């Protein structure tokens, strides 16, 4: 009767948490942000088109300098573009041309790639030989890779499809910390702007906070009806926005442990592939599958603009460290840097 | 444009040239996905030629250099976008499921599960114009079992001439091809066994037929 005894306790705990969350909501985001001027029609143009790819673009990451952005494509090449000149600094070859992630280290010395081979490869950029070579292939996952983010030059936080996330130590190659608690395939992870907390969203329609220092979950965020295909983090580090597959993004507050606003429209029937915020936090750049890059206002829960221009679906977004530009990569082997 | 900028532009152009060289040397190759369980141990093609387990081949001198791509062990809805441009799909089914038992406690069927997987793959939105080469393996084993083991376990109409050992094959073909309701997909099929050699020639023929059909469809001739 162990299963029967424990399930009642689990249901009681879940009901108590739900009741506490309901009682801890005096109002909503709209009730306090309805007195502010509308953001206005934020329309941006294609300043540059980083057109050098062949197959679909699956992910993209900027750098700390707001100049270099890496692009991962199933053709097998990790091109380190130069945004201000549309150049190609590097063309990193890949062992297996099945890549869904790319991370650019804060120091700009390492590029990460990973995919269906369950292996995250750390690529060294600054070498005395002038070529970019692997430094440490991180292995131990039993499933496909979904998102890798660099904590520092030595640690990489990796979320895979084996219902697990992981913290890796590159120098030794060992999984220093393993993360468990997801009842489904983890699809995207985001790192808080203090390298202390990181949130992940799996196919179980749940978003989970994790503390990389210890290795245990802190909060579980639910409310979505379908898979979470993207996740971001507010610049102030107390909120995070969840991209789903039911056409609705959300703003899950951290301290409040609830959802503040849902950005859903009757017209949209596709899903959200990537979600990225702006520097001020006013704009929630969401990349939908219907060849669009809809710009959602993040306080009024209202439309702000459309960044159409992509033939296929948008699969990666990025707003620079200084918030100057928003880059968009789609499955048409194209990259556009709006402003 | 200073000296550094001009040299960077030259490096970028060389990178573009190398990317084009790899792209034109990758279009020649043809991708062939490989799903199915029970009779997927196809080492014959690798021997003749020489997560994801790619097994490249070499057929028709250097004209055709195919690439096989195996399966995985996670959710099959986020790993499928990658294989949208495959020029063919290989589905392997074990004919020894006429008298089949499930791995779990249900013990219902194995070909029926294979049939459901086939229906899901055929009707998948991504593979809407990708031919499904079918390799019905375990030929001699079925030729023995349809006498010894059982006879038409499912029997909706299956195997009227059960002992004929050919009406069973015809009904299996009909059941597996009925899941393909469109004229844009050709479900090639070929029985094979361990002691066989014409196992990659059929793949080559199906690939050629698919290529010419796609060329015609992209054109207006047919």
């Amino acid at each position: 009767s162990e299963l029967d005894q424990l399930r009642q306790e689990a249901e009681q705990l879940k009901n108590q948490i739900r009741d506490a969350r309901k009682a801890c909501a005096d109002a909503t985001l709209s009730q306090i942000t309805n007195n502010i001027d509308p953001v206005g029609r934020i329309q941006m143009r294609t300043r540059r088109t980083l057109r050098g790819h062949l197959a679909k673009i699956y992910a993209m990451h900027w750098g700390t300098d707001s100049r270099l952005l890496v692009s991962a494509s199933q053709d097998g090449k990790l091109i380190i573009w130069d945004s201000y000149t549309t150049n190609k600094v590097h063309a990193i070859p890949l062992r297996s041309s099945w890549v869904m992630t790319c991370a650019y280290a804060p120091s700009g010395n390492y590029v990460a790639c990973g995919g269906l081979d369950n292996i995250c490869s750390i690529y060294n950029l600054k070498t005395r030989e002038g070529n970019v070579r692997v430094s440490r292939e991180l292995a131990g996952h039993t499933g496909y890779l979904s998102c890798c983010r660099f904590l520092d030059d030595n640690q990489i936080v990796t979320s895979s499809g084996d219902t697990t996330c992981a913290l890796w130590d590159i120098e030794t190659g060992q999984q220093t910390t393993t993360f468990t608690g997801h009842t489904g395939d983890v699809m995207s992870l985001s790192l808080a702007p203090d390298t202390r907390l990181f949130v992940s969203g799996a196919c179980d329609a749940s978003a989970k906070l994790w503390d990389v220092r210890e290795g245990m979950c802190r909060q579980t965020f639910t409310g979505h009806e379908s898979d979470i295909n993207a996740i971001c983090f507010f610049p102030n580090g107390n909120a995070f926005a969840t991209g789903s597959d039911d056409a609705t993004c959300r703003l899950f507050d951290l301290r409040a442990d609830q959802e503040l606003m849902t950005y859903s429209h009757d017209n949209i029937i596709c899903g959200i592939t990537s979600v990225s915020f702006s520097k001020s936090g006013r704009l929630l750049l969401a990349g939908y599958d219907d060849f669009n890059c809809n710009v959602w206002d993040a306080l009024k829960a209202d439309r702000a603009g459309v960044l159409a221009g992509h033939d296929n679906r948008v699969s990666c977004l990025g707003v620079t460290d200084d918030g100057m530009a928003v880059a968009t990569g789609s499955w048409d082997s194209f990259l556009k840097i709006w402003n | 444009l200073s000296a550094e900028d001009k040299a960077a532009v030259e490096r970028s152009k060389m990178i573009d040239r190398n990317l084009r060289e790899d792209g034109e040397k990758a279009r020649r190759e043809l991708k062939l996905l490989l799903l199915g369980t029970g009779e997927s141990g196809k080492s014959t093609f690798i021997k003749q030629m020489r997560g994801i387990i790619e097994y490249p081949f070499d057929l028709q001198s250097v004209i055709f250099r195919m690439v096989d791509v195996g399966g995985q062990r996670s959710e099959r809805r986020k790993w499928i976008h990658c294989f949208e441009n495959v020029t063919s799909i290989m589905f392997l089914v074990a004919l020894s499921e006429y008298d089949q038992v499930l791995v779990e406690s249900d013990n219902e069927n194995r070909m029926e599960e294979s049939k459901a997987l086939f229906r899901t793959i055929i009707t998948y939105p991504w593979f809407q114009n990708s031919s499904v080469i079918l390799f019905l393996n375990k030929k001699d084993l079925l030729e023995e079992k349809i006498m010894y083991s059982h006879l038409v376990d499912y029997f909706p109409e299956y195997d009227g001439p059960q002992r004929d050992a050919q009406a069973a094959r015809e009904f299996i073909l009909k059941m597996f091809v009925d899941l393909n309701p469109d004229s844009d997909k050709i479900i090639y099929s070929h029985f094979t066994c361990a002691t066989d050699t014409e196992n990659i020639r059929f793949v080559f023929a199906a690939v050629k037929d698919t290529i010419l059909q796609l060329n015609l469809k992209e054109y207006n001739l047919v």
Partner: single-chain antibody
Amino acid sequence: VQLVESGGGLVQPGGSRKLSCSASGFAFSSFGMHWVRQAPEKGLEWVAYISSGSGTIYYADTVKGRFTISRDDPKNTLFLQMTSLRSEDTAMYYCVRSIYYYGSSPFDFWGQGTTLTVSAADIVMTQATSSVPVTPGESVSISCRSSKSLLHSNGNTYLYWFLQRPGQSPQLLIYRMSNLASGVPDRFSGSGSGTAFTLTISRLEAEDVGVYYCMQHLEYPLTFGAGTKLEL
């Protein structure tokens, strides 16, 4: 990473020779290669450069035409076939590697060098100072002046500082007048306007004794400087 160059002894006034530079330790194809010479009791002087893919080749004005430089990628060797040799070209010829991308470090390696003795509108950088006596463990500043502003519209100011310890190949201290190359201690620091430059060495030691050469890299005439002697 090593670039040893050899193939030069003594040439008659009027002869010709070819200089060989065998490279092993990196990728030659992606790396451009320069050529820098220094006459005895004199300063560094630019000779030629060849880019990746043998696309762009430049030569110094004083040796224009009389020199030819070729790249041999398969054998990883550089050549310089000297023609119409004179007695004023006697110097020590170096192999300098360079790669150019965003954040690159041009002139980040210099070979041992080869000796060759022959019997009998550029941006000319100004180095008024010749020698400076500096104690080991005290700060010292070295300055050189440029005729033309060294600040392109790209926002990057181009000036390279070099160090030649006695009897050793030159090393790269600071590239683009603000960035410190690998293998150099943090004491070195460069600053200044688009015409006047400085270099604030913090704690000078026995390893900081040599001649400091400042370099201009905006035009192709990559004019170097006379240099500054450092004494204990």
